[PDB]
Design a protein around this nucleic acid. Structure first.
Lengths: 129, 80, 205, 6, 123, 82, 150
RNA sequence: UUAGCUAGUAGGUGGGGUAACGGCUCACCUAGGCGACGAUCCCUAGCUGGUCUGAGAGGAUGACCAGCCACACUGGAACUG
RNA sequence: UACCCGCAGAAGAAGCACCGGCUAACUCCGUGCCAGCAGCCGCGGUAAUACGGAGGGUGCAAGCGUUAAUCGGAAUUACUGGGCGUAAAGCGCACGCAGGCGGUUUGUUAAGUCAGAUGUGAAAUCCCCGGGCUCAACCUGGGAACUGCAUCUGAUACUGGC
C-alpha cells in the first residue's frame, strides 16, 4: 500500500516516459524533492516544480532526445522490505559509471559518482540508467 | 563510562531477581534483511527497586548467583 | 615424456611446418606433406569450433616439444600474469631454455636442441642447467658448455641457424658460443599461424 | 525416440 | 519468494541419491556370489545378458552384470563389484570387475583390455 | 620459564630455524609468543644468513627468560654493535 | 571484410499425405570487425540452398553496434523469448568467453574479449536474437552527450 | 511425524566452602527459571585456523600441519604435588 | 651422502583409454537382434565407422583408464539469482493475535546507518614483489590481506525510538 512512496516516484517516472509524456505529477515529499534535485542536476529530467501549499504537489518535467527518452531504465534498490546501505568503496557504480545511483549520506543526498569522491557513504535510493 | 547499556524489564515479581531484555537491529548474514534479535539478562536488584516494564541501564559485573552477572545502574522512564 | 616418433606425421596434421626436421635443408616438404596425415589424409576435415581450437594448441605444444600435464600450468601461469595471457603463454613458451638454445642456433631442431641441454652441454650465469625447462630471465646469458665446445654436430647447426629469420631479443655470437637474453619477446616480433585467444579459450570452458 | 519406458 | 519468508522458513537444499548404494559409497566391494544366471533385456534389445546375484560383504545382496564374452564364474566364486549401471536390464546397477579375485578376465580380448581384465599377450 | 629458542621449519636436509619467545614447556614448533628473527644454516656465501630483533630479545631477557645455548651462539656470532 | 559463418542447421518436417517432407533451416551471422552485425535464418529443401539463402537476409538487416576498443562499455544483458543473456567487458580477459551459438555473433561483430553467459533457453535462434537485441540497446558511451552532457 | 522443560530447580538471607566469585554445599525463606529468535527431547558430530570447488555469493569438508578441547581396558574415586 | 670428473655404449626404460553423435579421431573382415556394446541418445536380425579382431587414426605418458566421492555446469531451492491462468505451483473463503511492512511536517535521539581513529582478528596457508635448492614442486624475506568485533570522538539525509 502507501507503504512505499519512493518506488512510486521511480515508477511514475519510468512509466511516464514510457507513455511519452512531458510532465508527471505526484504528491510531494521532502526526500522526493531531494531526489528530484539529483535527477535535474545530473541531467535526467528538464526539471522539477513544486506548487503545493496545504497538500504539497510535485511535478517533474520529462526530457527526451531521438527515438527514445532519457532514462533507459530506473530501478528501486533499497526498499522498506529490505534496506541496503554501503560503505565508501562498497558504493555501487551504474553502467561502468555511465549512470548515477542515488545514495543518501549523513551529509545530504548525492550520486554514486558524487558520494564516492565525497568520501563518506550511506543508503542507496535507487538505480537510474 | 565503563560500557553502559539500556534495556527493559520483563517482570516485577521475583524478589531480588530482576531480568531484562535487549533489542538489536541485525543484518541477516545472507538475505540482508534487518532482524530483531533479543537477549535476556538476569540482573542484581538490591532492595528490589524499579518495578516491571521500566527501562534501565545495566553494567556487566562479578557473578552473584548461578547465572546472574549484571547489576542495574540507573532507571529511565516507568510507564510502558 | 617427449614425442619420440613420426614427427612429420605431426606437421602433416597441422598442415604447417613445426620446425621439426629442421637440420640441413630447412623449409620442409618431401614426405607427402598434406594429402595424407594418416590413411585418410586425403579427406576434407570439415572440423568443428572445437577442432579449430584444440588443433591450435595441439600445435603450439608440438611447435616446442612441450606436453599437456605441463603446458596447462604454463597457461595457468600466464593467467596470473597481468596482460594478454595469450602473448604471455607465448612469452613463457619462448622463455624456455630448451628454446633459447635452439633459437640461438646452438642446435639444429628444437629436438636436437634438447639432447644436449639434457646431457649437460649448456648453462647459464654459471651452474650447468640440467632441466630443459629452465625459465630464462632478462640478461641471463647461456653458453654452450666450454667443455664439449664446437663438435661433430653443433657446428653444422649454426650454419642454417643465422640464415634463418633471426630473432630480435638475443645477442648471439658464433665461435664464442654464448648468447644473451637481451629482452622478453614482444608480440610484434614473433608469430605466423599461431593464435592466442583461440587457445586461451580452450582452457576457459 | 524414447526407450525402456517411453 | 519474499525475504521475510526466506528469512523464516529458509531455503532447503535437496540432497543427492547415489545411484549405487551398495554401501560406504566406496570404490568397489567383495561379494560371495549367490547365483549365476542370464536374463533378457528391455524391448528394443534382445540378447541373453549374463548376470550374477552376489552377496556383498556389507550384507546387501545384489545383482551384477558380467561384461565381456564368457566368464569363469559359477555357484560360489568371489567377485568384486564395481559400479555403472546396465541401462537394458533394470535392477542391474552394478558391474562385477573382470579379472579380480575369483573372476577370470575375458579370454583373448586384445582391445581395451584394461577393462575385461587381461594382460598384454606377447608384445 | 619463557625460553627463546629455534623451531625446525626447514625441509628435508635444508632446515630453517626461527628464534621465538616461548613457554619452555611447549613443543618445538608448538605454541609460541612472537617470532623474533631467524637462522639460515645454508645461505652460501651471499647476502643473508641470520636476522634478530636484538633490541627485542633484551626486552624478554628483561622479564627473565633463559636463552637456548644454540640461540646464544647467534646473539654474538653476529656481534652486538659494530 | 565479409566475416560470415553459420551457427546451427536443423532438419524440420511438414507431415503431408504420403509421408513427410524434410526441409532444412540454417542460422548464420555476419558483420565486419568494427560495429555492424546481423543474422539471418532462412530455409530451403536443400542444405546449401538454405545456408546460401541464410547469408541473404544476413547481408540485409545489419544494425550498427557501439563498441569500445574491441569490447563493450556498460556491461549489458538482453532478452528474447526464452533466453535471457548477459555480458561483461574488460580488457580481453582471454578472448570472447561465451557459449556456443551465442559466440559467433560476438566474434564476427568484432569483440575479442567479453565474459558472457547464457541463461534461460540455449536454443541458438533465440539467443543470437537475444544477444543482438542485447548489443543493440547498448547506449552510446563516447556519445553519451545524448542525454549526457545534458 | 520432538511443545513444553526444570526443586537445589530460579532468587534471597545466613552458616560452611574454594585459590577465587558462584547454589559450590546446607539451612531457612520468598516462587521462580528457561521456551516457538525453537527450550526439551531424539539423531548426528571433536571446534577454529583452514582445506576442495566456484566468476563470485556460496556449497562441501576439517586427513597431513598449528591453536583450543576431550579421552587414555569400562565405570568411579581420591591421593601426592 | 648432496655434488663434481671420467669409463662404456643407444646400449638399459612405454603404456593405457578412445574413433556414430556430444567428443579430436576410418576402414576391412567376421558376425547376424546371436555374440556383445553402452555415460545419455542409441548400436546388432548378411555387405554394421557403435559388437570382436586387424589396419589406420586420436588423445594422455610413467601412466593411462574405470569405479567411488565433493563442488561445477544446475538461474535444477534462484541472497547475489527462478517461479505458480493452462507447464509442478495461490490456502475453498473470510476475521485476526505474534511477526514483517507503513502516509506526511517539525524538534529531538543517535540505536540501526555512516566516516576518522585505536585496540584486536596467532603463526602457517591463499595473494602481491623478491631470495635460495640447477628448474619447478619444495624452502624462505617482506607486504596486503584476515571482508569480523569492541571501545571512543564525529555525521545526520534515510531508517528506529521520544
Amino acid at each position: 500500500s502507501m507503504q512505499d512512496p519512493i518506488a512510486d516516484m521511480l515508477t511514475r517516472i519510468r512509466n511516464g516516459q514510457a507513455a511519452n509524456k512531458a510532465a508527471v505529477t505526484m504528491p510531494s515529499s521532502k526526500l522526493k524533492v531531494a531526489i528530484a534535485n539529483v535527477l535535474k542536476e545530473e541531467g535526467f529530467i528538464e526539471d522539477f516544480k513544486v506548487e503545493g501549499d496545504t497538500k504539497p504537489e510535485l511535478e517533474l518535467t520529462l526530457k527526451y532526445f531521438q527515438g527514445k527518452a532519457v532514462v533507459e531504465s530506473i530501478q528501486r534498490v533499497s526498499r522498506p522490505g529490505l534496506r541496503i546501505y554501503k560503505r565508501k568503496d562498497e558504493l555501487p557504480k551504474v553502467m561502468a559509471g555511465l549512470g548515477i545511483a542515488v545514495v543518501s549520506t549523513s551529509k545530504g543526498v548525492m550520486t554514486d559518482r558524487a558520494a564516492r569522491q565525497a568520501g563518506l557513504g550511506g543508503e542507496i535510493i535507487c538505480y537510474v540508467a | 563510562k565503563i560500557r553502559t547499556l539500556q534495556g527493559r524489564v520483563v517482570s516485577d515479581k521475583m524478589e531480588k531477581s530482576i531480568v531484562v531484555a535487549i533489542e538489536r537491529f541485525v543484518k541477516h548474514p545472507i538475505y540482508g534483511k534487518f532482524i530483531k534479535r533479543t537477549t535476556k539478562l538476569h540482573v542484581h536488584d538490591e532492595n528490589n527497586e524499579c518495578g516491571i516494564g521500566d527501562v534501565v541501564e545495566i553494567r556487566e559485573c562479578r557473578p552473584l548467583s548461578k547465572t546472574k552477572s549484571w547489576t542495574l545502574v540507573r532507571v529511565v522512564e516507568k510507564a510502558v | 615424456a617427449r614425442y619420440l616418433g613420426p614427427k612429420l606425421k605431426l606437421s602433416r596434421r597441422e598442415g604447417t611446418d613445426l620446425f621439426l626436421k629442421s637440420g640441413v635443408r630447412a623449409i620442409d616438404t618431401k614426405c607427402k606433406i598434406e594429402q595424407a596425415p594418416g590413411q585418410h589424409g586425403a579427406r576434407k576435415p570439415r572440423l568443428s569450433d572445437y577442432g579449430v581450437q584444440l588443433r591450435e594448441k595441439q600445435k603450439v605444444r608440438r611447435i616446442y616439444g612441450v606436453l599437456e600435464r605441463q603446458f596447462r600450468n604454463y597457461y595457468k601461469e600466464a593467467a596470473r600474469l597481468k596482460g594478454n595471457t595469450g602473448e604471455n603463454l607465448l612469452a613463457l613458451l619462448e622463455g624456455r631454455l630448451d628454446n633459447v638454445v635452439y633459437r640461438m642456433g646452438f642446435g639444429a631442431t628444437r629436438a636436437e636442441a634438447r639432447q644436449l641441454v639434457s646431457h649437460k652441454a649448456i648453462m647459464v650465469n654459471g651452474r650447468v642447467v640440467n632441466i630443459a625447462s629452465y625459465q630464462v630471465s632478462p640478461n641471463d646469458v647461456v653458453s654452450i658448455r666450454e667443455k664439449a665446445k664446437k663438435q661433430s654436430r653443433v657446428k653444422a647447426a649454426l650454419e642454417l641457424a643465422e640464415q634463418r629469420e633471426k630473432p630480435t631479443w638475443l645477442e648471439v655470437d658464433a665461435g664464442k658460443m654464448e648468447g644473451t637474453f637481451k629482452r622478453k619477446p614482444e608480440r610484434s616480433d614473433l608469430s605466423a599461424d599461431i593464435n592466442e585467444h583461440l587457445i586461451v579459450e580452450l582452457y576457459s570452458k | 525416440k524414447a526407450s525402456s519406458x517411453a | 519468494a519474499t525475504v521475510n519468508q526466506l528469512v523464516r522458513k529458509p531455503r532447503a537444499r535437496k540432497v543427492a541419491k547415489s545411484n549405487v548404494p551398495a554401501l560406504e559409497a566406496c570404490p568397489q566391494k567383495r561379494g560371495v556370489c549367490t547365483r549365476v544366471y542370464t536374463t533378457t533385456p528391455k524391448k528394443p534389445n534382445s540378447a541373453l545378458r549374463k548376470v550374477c546375484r552376489v552377496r556383498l560383504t556389507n550384507g546387501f545382496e545384489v545383482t551384477s552384470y558380467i561384461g565381456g564374452e564368457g566368464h569363469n564364474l559359477q555357484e560360489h566364486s568371489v567377485i568384486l563389484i564395481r559400479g555403472g549401471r546396465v541401462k537394458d536390464l533394470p535392477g542391474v546397477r552394478y558391474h562385477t570387475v573382470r579379472g579380480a579375485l575369483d573372476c577370470s578376465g575375458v579370454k583373448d580380448r586384445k582391445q581395451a583390455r584394461s577393462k575385461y581384465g587381461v594382460k598384454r599377450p606377447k608384445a | 620459564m619463557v625460553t627463546i629458542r629455534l623451531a625446525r621449519h626447514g625441509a628435508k636436509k635444508r632446515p630453517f630455524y626461527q628464534v621465538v619467545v616461548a613457554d619452555s614447556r611447549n613443543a618445538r614448533n608448538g605454541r609460541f609468543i612472537e617470532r623474533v628473527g631467524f637462522f639460515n644454516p645454508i645461505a652460501s656465501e651471499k647476502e643473508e644468513g641470520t636476522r634478530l630483533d636484538l633490541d627485542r630479545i633484551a626486552h624478554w631477557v628483561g622479564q627473565g627468560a633463559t636463552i637456548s645455548d644454540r640461540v646464544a651462539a647467534l646473539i654474538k656470532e653476529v656481534n652486538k654493535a659494530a | 571484410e565479409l566475416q560470415e559463418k553459420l551457427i546451427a542447421v536443423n532438419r524440420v518436417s511438414k507431415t503431408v499425405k504420403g509421408g513427410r517432407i524434410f526441409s532444412f533451416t540454417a542460422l548464420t551471422v555476419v558483420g565486419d570487425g568494427n560495429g555492424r552485425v546481423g543474422f539471418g535464418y532462412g530455409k530451403a529443401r536443400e542444405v546449401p540452398a538454405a545456408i546460401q539463402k541464410a547469408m541473404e537476409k544476413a547481408r540485409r538487416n545489419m544494425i550498427n553496434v557501439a563498441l569500445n576498443n574491441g569490447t563493450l562499455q556498460h556491461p549489458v544483458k538482453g532478452v528474447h523469448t526464452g533466453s535471457r543473456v548477459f555480458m561483461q567487458p574488460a580488457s580481453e580477459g582471454t578472448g570472447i568467453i561465451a557459449g556456443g551459438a551465442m559466440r559467433a555473433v560476438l566474434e564476427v561483430a568484432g569483440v575479442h574479449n567479453v565474459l558472457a553467459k547464457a541463461y534461460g533457453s540455449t536454443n541458438p535462434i533465440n539467443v543470437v536474437r537475444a544477444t543482438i537485441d542485447g548489443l543493440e540497446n547498448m547506449n552510446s558511451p563516447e556519445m553519451v552527450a545524448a542525454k549526457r552532457g545534458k
